[PDB]
From a paper:
The insulin-related hormones regulate key life processes in Metazoa, from metabolism to growth, lifespan and aging, through an evolutionarily conserved insulin signalling axis (IIS). The dmIR primary structure, with ~33% sequence identity in the overlapping regions, suggests that its domain organisation is similar to human IR-like receptors. dmIR domain topology, similar to hIR, is made of unique (αβ)2 subunit homodimers, with the same modular, exons-reflecting organisation. We selected the Drosophila DILP5 for dmIR-ECD studies as a typical representative and well-characterised fly ILP, having also a high homology to human insulin (~28% sequence identity), and with nM-range KD for the dmIR high-affinity site 1 of 0.76 (±0.16) nM21 that is within a range of human insulin:hIR interaction (e.g., 0.2–0.7 nM). Here, we provide the 3-D description of an invertebrate IR-like receptor by determining the cryoEM structure of the dmIR-ECD in the complex with DILP5.
The 5:1 molar hormone:receptor ratio used for the preparation of the dmIR-ECD complex resulted in an asymmetric three-DILP5:dmIR-ECD arrangement. There are two adjacent insulins bound to sites 1 and 2’ on the down-arm/dynamic and static protomers, respectively, and one insulin at site 1’ on the arm-up/static protomer. The overall DILP5’s binding modes in site 1 (down-arm (Λ) and up-arm site 1’ (Γ)) follows closely engagements of human insulins in respective h(m)IR sites. However, the third DILP5 molecule binds to site 2’ on the FnIII-1’ domain of the static protomer being adjacent to - and in contacts with - the down-arm site 1-bound DILP5, while site 2 is unoccupied. However, DILP5 sits ~6 Å lower on the FnIII-1’ side-surface than insulin in hIR’s sites 2/2’, with its B-helix also closer by ~2.7 Å to the FnIII-1’, especially when compared at the Cα atoms of ValB16(LeuB17) (in brackets: corresponding sequences of hIR (or human insulin)). This lowering of site 2’ DILP5 is likely required for the simultaneous accommodation of both DILP5s in sites 1 and 2’ in the lower-arm environment. Here, the shorter Lys884-Gly886 FnIII-1 loop minimises the steric hindrance upon binding of both DILP5s into the lower arm site1/2’ space, while the longer – dmIR specific - Ala1168-Ser1189 loop (with central short Ile1173-Thr1181 helix) provides a supporting ledge for the site 2’-bound hormone. In the dmIR-ECD this loop is slightly longer, and—importantly—it is reconfigured into a narrow β-hairpin that points directly into the DILP5 binding cavity that would be occupied by the C-domain of single-chain insulin-like family of hormones. Another characteristic structural feature of the dmIR-ECD is the reshaped - and slightly longer than in the hIR - Ala594-615Asn (Cys259-280His) CR-domain loop, which may prevent binding of any insulin-like hormone with a significant C-domain (e.g., hIGF-1-like).
Residue numbers in the entry:
A (entry chain F), B (entry chain E), G (entry chain C): 1 to 24
C (entry chain A): 328 to 482, 513 to 985, 1032 to 1047, 1118 to 1310
D (entry chain B): 335 to 494, 511 to 986, 1023 to 1046, 1118 to 1310
E (entry chain H): 2 to 27
F (entry chain G): 1 to 25
H (entry chain D): 1 to 27
The structure:
């Protein structure tokens, strides 16, 4: 089911799906 | 990179695999 | 060592007290009832001359039925301390049914009901029945079997509950070590007592009833040799053969056998010719044959005890309609466990509380000699609300004729019915499609299932990722083993489906197949078994679970348990009720409240005020004149898609005074989380402030480490409450007011007025108003308005007056409004000369 | 020369864009769709001059100019339109030049170039030249530039090439202006001055000499011959002619489905005309053999709505295997909508019909035209023609008065728990064997309807009382509880007194009364539903006054009692009760005499409004604290689970025991003049309820009036004589509005002003001023202000403030003056404000006398 | 003839008999 | 069997002459 | 009269597998 | 599962539904 977020909600879900982190 | 999410799949909807692909 | 019973037992038979109150003489001097006690259809008990303090106990069950004019059972039973329940009526031990005057129960002395349960119903006037903790009087696990309905309720107080037998008496608890055996809420008693014990004036102690048996009225765990147990007490053989129980609308003698006074020889034995004894059946097994008929109740299933062949053309119809049914399996064992074959069909229809046919412990064959239902069916199983398994493990029930029929058994899954396939005479591979409804059976039961573990990989504030850490295998790649679950066909498994909902209490039942039970949000299938949730509310308990989805050809289910997680706190909502009211020229009280949800723990509010510049007197205002469509988008898609305000970086404790140090230009303070008001002080007079209250929440370690990568903020938005401090009185007073007369020889006197502009007025000076008053009577004060800039750069003004004593005053009119008038200045003007003088 | 392409469906893999090459005519339409990034288009297609049908450009991105794709576009004929449009250019966020500069004719239908946020230069083309003139209502252009500019882009030559046009300029972009052809041209020519010959369409090209050839030519083309009409044996197809057999090679695409070309009437046509069908040799048209034409389709599984759609417009369903309605998805109520779409046109299921596991499906009503199941190869060894199994929610078969003759095999019905056996027994007249009954082996009597509301009797319920906010519903039917007496008129008898839990009353607000009973869908919760009430009298409550309500009743019984009954839906209306407060009452002062009051009754009436009652009450004149003196400033189910448990226990027990402020009373027209006859102290009028403005008159100058407005409704016949009206409530509540009237001009003039000297011997002259207090002031007099001035220049006019508390007891104020002639004038000050002065009086003050002459 | 059940049967027996209603052990 | 009013009457459709058999005292 | 998402999923609800029927 | 998508919110969901494209008329 397609995700949709922007700004700090987007950063929150990238920090969600990436427990091993993501390049800034 | 926040560049890639703000530029792609914020004005569009991310798949789960798409969002996972921004994890390192 | 050992203790006597209290008093001494006089036994009584299974009394029936019927119609006439003079029948209550049957209870006269009864210490114990050696069977049931039935009290019924006394149509007015008010003539009752006696209560009966000797009825310590009943071995079987109490039934109080349709009795009227009876206001409390304590008026019969002072000391009914235990119901033993060695037999149970339908599984109930106490029945109190339709007793229209029984407004009070009154069994204060009742300490144990030792088997079965209680049904108190249709006592439209009874009250407080709802209060007593029946689950504390009852046996340790029968807590399903207490039922309380149609009682009026007039519509220690242990652990905040009023466990009291109406107004006067409260039901005792006992402490954990002596439940149902304490004499008082302090005092346990010896385990060989049941239903409590009496301690005499000396400290000698007596059981009210023995936990097992008694001889010579002394409690002991088993009889002495030479005697036989009979419910309450040991008896001789010559007693036992005369003692009796009433059962099945029949009287049975006791048989003294194998240490017991038994009304029926045990399995493999049958009565002796004289009935005094039991001896083996011919060849060691008996062959009791019984007519088929409708089992409507457990009390009717009693009628089958010791049957072994069920016979005759009617289908044997189990139709027990108990609810919850803690006793259903036990009394059905007692009824039909000895059945080894059924000559007719078996039918089990409209049952409730019947979990399983495991009570047919000995059943091996359904001969179906005459079948039923156009003779088509032999094991017919319809509309059972609780039936969920058939025979015991490895039990077989061969069926000689007819099919099965299974319909509307919501909790019995087709995989379980299919176990019967190796039991039909035809040994078919399948049932005919008239004979097992595929959707009717098991649609509420956990079918062919294996558990999925689900692991929550990460919690965010608005998102979380669930990973199905139980494996799945598809096909037989490399011939797998320990797959945990297998789908035989790669087409069949469509994927995992994820369910979640907001669930603060974390106890929601799984999503039912009801079409409008939509408590649960539900994902689409995700074959990888990992899903990232979105649009979660922060700090909120979300429940979630997973199930496998497969095409309807595949019966393989697998579901997780319900599990739960709380989202991270995220960001608090804006403050509420923030209003600023000036109390004084330098002080503002600020209200606020926090009635919107915090999304975490608020640690402190931050309250700030910013001074704003005083208003400007515009050139547009006259100083003295104006004093203080989509249908095409839908069509086009159908044709195309052919199916195939500044942020927390500014927030800190801060203080900054005016260049003159007289007022705060900025003030900000961090406050305890219970503080919901603040008073600013040493503010500037008549000047606007912006104000905001911003709450901040408890910082969390991963959040503050995570924040290092994406710069989130802990604190709510502004809602700046712009308003002005009060006017400082006196400040606009014109000062150093002076009036002089110039010596220019005009025919009317050029009066000069001067003053110091105010030290620090309430905002800008708009105009000066000069006032003068000839100090005669018959005069009034007259007023001249002058623009402020016309005076200030002049530091003087000339007014022309004729002779007389004039009072003079001046005040400013700032944007804050008229200031005070000055103290009254004066001039003593003198007349111009007349040259005839 | 004129090599064609069929329709094109261009796609984001730009290698699909190469389909356009080496054909100048698209023989159908152009779709360009969802190219996510068209930037890799190095090509261009100037070969493309013409499209027969229409252009769609939809959400193309990575594309900047249509000149990039197909710049030589010269004609769109519109031989079809998309929804009336020949040119749709929709949501192309990157599209920024509509560089169709050579486009001349859009020969039919409209143009819709919209939501292209970067496409400036849209209205900058006079599209009305390009269309046919009749179509000039069909140009639509929107959302071309939400935020991109505030009129910052500009045309060629113009200052923020071509002349001025429409008093602006006509512009494809910042570079190019709209090509013309003369007024006696018609967009068939390609210079501003000299059009082509009138056989051409779009434009012509002139050779290196002066031989002129069409780009496209109007009526038809063949061998590139500009032609009036195709010769015999050449069939017209939108632009060119074809041979007879070539027509069958052609296609046109419609409704997401293919159609071949059929050569008829000298044309290729996609459909034979109404009443004809495609010939068996697929190359000719013939009349419908029955006079009606009937699309014939193949039988198969219908597992989903997206599959069911494939049958749309089918009329005969054919093949050796059963049409199998198996909507296993618990889809709910839209299942019938897509199934009706798919199958409602079927006349004849040759294959036999199966209906299996379907959850959502309520009925077979969706076969709205099914009339035969020929059963030529019936299911299960020809045994069954109609097989209906496991359908959880199926409870009705065909439509009312629907007949469906079944020729071969029986009908098999099992495990349809809601399909009543008495409904299946409506198929008995429909089998060819016309059989007397269905065996246990065909229609399982326990397998069907064991949860249907089968055999429902009809209750009669009557509204025995009504209120404004309550109603009494009484079930009049003789529902007998416990077995009947044999002669009784018992309509339904519950053979066990406790099997009947009660009547359940349903009601809803439904103004139209066209509502119908709730389906078993728990999402159908339109109805409030009572607890079961065994008395059968339910006092409905908290109803909205004068509202149309609907209600119905069903008997609720334990699940194993088959007796049940159910009313029709019945309609009633609550009493009108108290009408809501009138709103917007605002009172505005016109003068010292008149008020205009405006209101409007926004909140709803109950019943019919009959009057607005307007009442004005004169408040007392104001009065002010003269001790706080102000000379300074006067100026202005468990019902089954637990019941059944009770039943079988009580049976077991019984087997054991017996072994042998103005009340609206006052709202009446009134006038109450004050004693002076000059003004009203109360005025009231029962205006017609058509009026919402009222003008007062003869109000007292400068006074506050309280104003009511009240809306009242007609009394109900039971109220006017059975209540004795004592509950009243015919009239709304009201809010006391206020308005202050206005000051009467000059009413504060002091009258009878006179000034004289007293004769008492004096040194300073005792001037006495006399007057009478104002006879009818704008309220209480604060003070009199007397102004007086020595009558020469360079004198200021003095003023004295004299409290009204002084003048009567003085009977004339006394002022001291000396030699001079003085102006005098006076005004009163009311607490309403300063007055206006009298005209100037004069006095000659004589000098201080002296005797030393 | 009669098919009283439940409270209907309680009502028929209790109303349609005298004070005599004796059963067990009698 | 059949030994009670709820079998004899109710589902057994007793005659009143049977129903009195429980009252006989 | 069309098969397409604008009445599959806009005029009422749909399951995501219906959208997946349009993909290539 | 409650798609309800319309207009651009449907286009943005169909492009959410596959990485590859859609359109395949007469192909």
């Amino acid at each position: 089911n397609s995700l949709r977020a922007c700004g700090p909600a987007l950063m929150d879900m990238l920090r969600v799906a990436c427990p091993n982190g993501f390049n800034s | 990179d926040f560049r890639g999410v703000v530029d792609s799949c914020c004005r569009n909807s991310c798949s789960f695999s798409t969002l996972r692909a921004y994890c390192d | 060592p050992t203790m006597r019973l209290s008093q001494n037992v006089k036994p009584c038979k299974s009394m029936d007290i019927r119609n006439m109150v003079s029948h209550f003489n049957q209870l006269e001097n009864c210490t114990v009832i050696e069977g049931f006690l039935l009290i019924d259809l006394i149509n007015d008990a008010s003539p009752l001359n006696r209560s009966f303090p000797k009825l310590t106990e009943v071995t079987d069950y109490i039934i109080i039925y349709r009795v009227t004019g009876l206001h409390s059972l304590s008026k019969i039973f002072p000391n009914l301390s235990v119901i033993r329940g060695n037999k149970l009526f339908d599984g109930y031990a106490l029945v109190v049914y339709s007793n229209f005057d029984l407004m009070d129960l009154g069994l204060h002395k009742l300490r144990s009901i030792t088997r079965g349960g209680v049904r108190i119903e249709k006592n439209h006037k009874l009250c407080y029945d709802r209060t007593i903790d029946w689950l504390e009087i009852l046996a340790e696990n029968e807590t399903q079997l207490v039922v309380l309905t149609e009682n009026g309720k007039e519509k220690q107080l242990h652990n905040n509950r009023r466990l009291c037998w109406n107004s006067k008496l409260c039901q005792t608890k006992c402490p954990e070590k002596c439940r149902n055996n304490c004499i008082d809420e302090h005092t346990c008693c010896s385990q060989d007592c049941l239903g409590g014990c009496v301690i005499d004036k000396n400290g000698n102690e007596s059981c009210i009833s023995c936990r097992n048996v008694s001889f010579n009225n002394i409690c002991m765990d088993s009889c002495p040799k030479g005697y036989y147990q009979f419910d309450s007490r040991c008896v001789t053989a010559n007693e036992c053969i005369t003692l009796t129980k009433f059962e099945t609308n029949s009287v049975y003698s006791g048989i003294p056998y194998n240490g017991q006074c038994i009304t029926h020889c045990p399995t493999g034995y049958q009565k002796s010719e004289n009935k005094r004894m039991c001896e083996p059946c011919p060849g060691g097994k008996c062959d009791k044959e019984c007519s088929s008929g409708l089992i409507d109740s457990l009390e009717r299933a009693r009628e089958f005890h010791g049957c072994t062949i069920i016979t005759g053309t009617e289908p044997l119809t189990i139709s027990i309609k108990r609810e919850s049914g803690a006793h259903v399996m036990d009394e059905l064992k007692y009824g039909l466990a000895a059945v080894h074959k059924i000559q007719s069909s078996l039918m089990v229809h409209l049952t409730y509380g019947l979990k399983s046919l495991k009570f047919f412990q000995s059943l091996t064959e359904i001969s179906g000699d005459p079948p039923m239902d156009a003779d088509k069916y032999a094991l017919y199983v319809l509309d059972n609300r609780d039936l969920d398994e058939l025979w015991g493990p490895n039990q077989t029930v061969f069926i000689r004729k007819g099919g099965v029929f299974f319909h509307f058994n919501p909790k019995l899954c087709v995989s379980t019915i299919n176990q019967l396939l190796p039991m039909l005479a035809s040994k078919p591979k399948f049932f005919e499609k008239s004979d097992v409804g595929a959707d009717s059976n098991g649609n509420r039961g956990s079918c062919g299932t294996a558990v999925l573990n689900v692991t929550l990989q990460s919690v965010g504030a608005n998102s979380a990722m669930l990973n199905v850490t139980t494996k799945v295998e598809i096909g037989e790649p490399q011939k797998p083993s320990n797959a945990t679950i297998v789908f035989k066909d790669p087409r069949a498994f469509i994927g995992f489906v994820f369910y979640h909902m907001i669930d603060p209490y974390g106890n929601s039942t799984k999503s039912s197949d009801d079409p409008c039970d939509d408590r649960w949000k539900v994902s689409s299938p995700e074959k990888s078994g990992v899903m990232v949730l979105s649009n979660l509310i922060p700090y909120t308990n979300y429940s979630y679970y997973v199930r496998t989805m497969a095409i309807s050809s595949e019966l393989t289910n697998a579901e997780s348990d319900v599990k739960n997680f709380r989202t991270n706190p995220g960001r608090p909502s804006k403050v509420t009720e923030v209003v600023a009211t000036a109390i004084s020229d330098s002080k503002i009280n600020v209200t606020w409240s926090y009635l919107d949800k915090p999304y975490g723990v608020l640690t402190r509010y931050f309250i700030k005020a910013k001074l704003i510049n005083r208003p400007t007197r515009n050139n547009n205002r006259d100083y003295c004149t104006e004093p203080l469509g989509m249908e095409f988008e839908n069509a086009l898609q159908n044709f195309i898609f052919v199916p195939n305000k500044d942020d927390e970086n500014t927030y800190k404790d801060e203080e900054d005074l005016s260049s003159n140090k007289q007022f705060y230009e900025v003030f900000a303070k961090e406050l305890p989380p219970n503080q919901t008001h603040f008073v600013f002080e040493k503010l500037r007079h008549f000047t606007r402030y912006a104000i905001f209250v911003v709450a901040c929440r408890e910082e969390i370690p991963s959040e503050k480490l995570r924040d290092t990568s994406f710069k989130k903020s802990l604190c709510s938005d502004y809602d700046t409450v712009f308003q002005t401090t009060k006017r400082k009185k006196f400040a606009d007073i014109v000062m150093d007011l002076k009036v002089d007369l110039e010596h220019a020889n005009n025919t009317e006197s050029p009066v000069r007025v001067r003053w110091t502009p105010p030290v620090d007025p309430n905002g800008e000076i708009v105009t000066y108003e000069v006032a003068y008053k000839l100090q005669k009577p018959d005069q009034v004060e007259e007023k001249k308005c002058i623009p402020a800039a016309d005076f200030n750069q002049t530091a003087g003004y000339l007014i022309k007056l004729n002779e007389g004593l004039y009072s003079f005053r001046v005040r400013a009119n700032s944007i804050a409004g008229y200031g005070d008038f000055t103290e009254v200045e004066h001039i003593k003007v003198e007349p111009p000369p007349s040259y005839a003088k």
